[PDB]
């Protein structure tokens, strides 16, 4: 019963994106590419109002595959040579419905010496019958 019941739902949005550059000279580990993945808010709105911490599960080949970002812009800047499906989990700060999301995002790259990669994605979060304080956070972002 979509909007058939008297329920007040708030809807937020998160952005999964990444830019992938190659280097004309690979790094010390001989990695050719440097990519920066990020999770952002709706239209560049700061999401730290409902977003607590975020995590990027990189490939085990990467030093510290688990990148949690509690600081400013949720982004990981790492170097590699090959792309892969990178599961991103976004943590929220609340005591209600599950405060973690799981977005499967493909980290793709170009050949060394080819057009870079700039892919943005926007995912909606929908919360049925949330607490007003939580709405206040979802609105303030």
């Amino acid at each position: 019963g979509s909007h058939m019941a008297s329920s007040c739902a708030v809807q937020v949005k998160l952005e999964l994106g990444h830019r992938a550059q190659v280097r004309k000279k690979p790094t010390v580990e001989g990695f050719t590419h440097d990519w920066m993945v990020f999770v952002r808010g709706p239209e560049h709105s700061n999401i730290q109002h409902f977003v607590e911490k975020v995590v990027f599960h990189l490939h085990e080949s990467f030093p510290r595959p688990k990148r949690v970002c509690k600081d400013p812009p949720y982004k990981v800047e790492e170097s590699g040579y090959a792309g892969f499906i990178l599961p991103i989990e976004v943590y929220f700060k609340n005591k209600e419905e599950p405060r973690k999301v799981r977005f499967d995002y493909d980290l793709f790259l170009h050949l060394e010496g080819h057009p870079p990669v700039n892919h943005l994605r926007c995912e909606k979060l929908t919360f049925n019958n949330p607490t007003e304080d939580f709405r206040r956070k979802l609105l303030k972002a």
Binding site: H33, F108, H110, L111
Partner: peptide
């Protein structure tokens, strides 16, 4: 397809 190399998380799973 036709892009940079790929190291999948699970080989043919």
């Amino acid at each position: 397809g036709g892009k940079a190399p790929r190291k999948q998380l699970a080989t043919k799973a």
